[PDB]
């Protein structure tokens, strides 16, 4: 008859205590398997995983998005845009086996929320209820952003995710986490030095480092600084565009502000495409391990 709607349905009897148990499981494994990627740990790749699985959404026909958890299928799993994400998938496998009742999309998104919180970032309210959909619902590759582009490209790309200037700049601050790996994306290097702590370092480095546009070993160009950091062409476009620059500057000078906006934008990202019943529960705000005397 007409267009797709995805209704949030949380499994019977499953509530906040259940999901907090899953959060804890991820947070614990994040601490136990700490050697990954030269001790950066799996936090950054989990955040990138939550973003890539949600970022396939197209607001115009409601295809893609985190709802269906389709990254588990071949086509999306092998999207070149997802090179390296297999690591986050493997990290979460045992977790899913311990908690078989949680949906795939619910697990991928919760993984990003847990990683952000456990890396001392802002609390990200989260809502359960994503439901696995058949392989046929797997979007084709090509929906994630190219990093070799400019501000106009970034702005129009994010319009497809219903994101505005503020939301775009805030979400990009996640690049404070982890690093680019030449074998994965054709780009190499960290955006900063505090790779596994969620801060506003991305904006600070963008504004305070001396950047030089250079070719890397994969023959792509990236902006490099003397400190050994890098910025993708799309990251640097945030100080090339005037509108974006003003927001970069305000986050560079106010982390609490960045945190609040990032929290709102990341949850929105994670919930795009999802219709939540009006009688559905208020979003959950999980306690960190630290907050549990753990």
């Amino acid at each position: 008859t007409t267009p797709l709607v995805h209704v949030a349905s949380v499994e019977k009897g499953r509530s906040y205590e259940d999901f907090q148990k899953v959060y804890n499981a991820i947070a614990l494994k994040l601490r136990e398997d700490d050697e990954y990627d030269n001790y950066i740990g799996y936090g950054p790749v989990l955040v990138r995983l939550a973003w890539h699985t949600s970022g396939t959404w197209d607001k115009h026909d409601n295809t893609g998005g985190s709802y269906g958890g389709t990254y588990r299928f071949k086509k999306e799993f092998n999207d070149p845009s997802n090179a390296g994400l297999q690591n986050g998938f493997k990290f979460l496998e045992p977790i899913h086996k311990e908690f078989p009742w949680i949906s795939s999309g619910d697990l991928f998104s919760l993984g990003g929320v847990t990683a952000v919180q456990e890396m001392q970032g802002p609390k990200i309210p989260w809502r359960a209820g994503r439901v696995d959909t058949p392989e046929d619902t797997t979007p084709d590759n090509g929906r994630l952003p190219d990093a070799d582009k400019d501000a106009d490209y970034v702005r129009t790309f994010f319009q497809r995710l219903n994101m505005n200037d503020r939301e775009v700049v805030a979400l990009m601050g996640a690049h404070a986490l982890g690093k680019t790996h030449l074998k994965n994306s054709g780009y190499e290097g960290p955006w900063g030095a505090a790779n596994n702590c969620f801060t506003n370092e991305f904006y600070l480095n963008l504004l305070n480092e001396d950047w030089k546009l250079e070719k890397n070993d994969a023959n792509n160009e990236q902006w490099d600084s003397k400190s050994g950091y890098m910025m993708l062409p799309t990251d640097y476009s945030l100080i090339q565009d005037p509108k974006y620059l003003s927001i970069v500057k305000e986050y560079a000078n106010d982390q609490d502000k960045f945190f609040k906006d990032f929290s709102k934008a990341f949850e929105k990202l994670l919930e795009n495409g999802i219709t939540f019943p009006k009688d559905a529960p208020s979003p959950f705000i999980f306690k960190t391990l630290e907050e549990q005397g753990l």
Binding site: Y39, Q120, A193, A194, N196, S227
Partner: protein, 108 residues
């Protein structure tokens, strides 16, 4: 925390894998993301000449020794709230002892 002598070799590996990213240990070595650590034991926190410390680190005004260093490395932000050093900490005593045994030697 109470330091107990350990393995300098294993401590060297811990340092290389967990600290070198941001710190050098040789005398006259350069500051990097973090302060060069030569002469760290016996000096007060935030006194490395030429490095821009956080306000919190300097105010801790801790005269570094093997014991409070062990306490610090167990949970940096906990011991010095607001420090900008990004590091969750070495939770195992054995790990902290091997590392400090090495640091005592490498810096000395």
């Amino acid at each position: 925390a109470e330091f107990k002598a350990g393995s300098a070799k294993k401590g060297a590996t811990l340092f290389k894998t967990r600290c070198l990213q941001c710190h050098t240990v040789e005398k006259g070595g350069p500051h990097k993301v973090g302060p060069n650590l030569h002469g760290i034991f016996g000096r007060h926190s935030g006194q490395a000449e030429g490095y821009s410390y956080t306000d919190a680190n300097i105010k801790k005004n801790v005269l570094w020794d093997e014991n409070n260093m062990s306490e610090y490395l167990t949970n940096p932000k906990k011991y010095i709230p607001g420090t900008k050093m990004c590091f969750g900490g070495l939770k195992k005593e054995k790990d902290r002892n091997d590392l400090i045994t090495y640091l005592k030697k490498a810096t000395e």
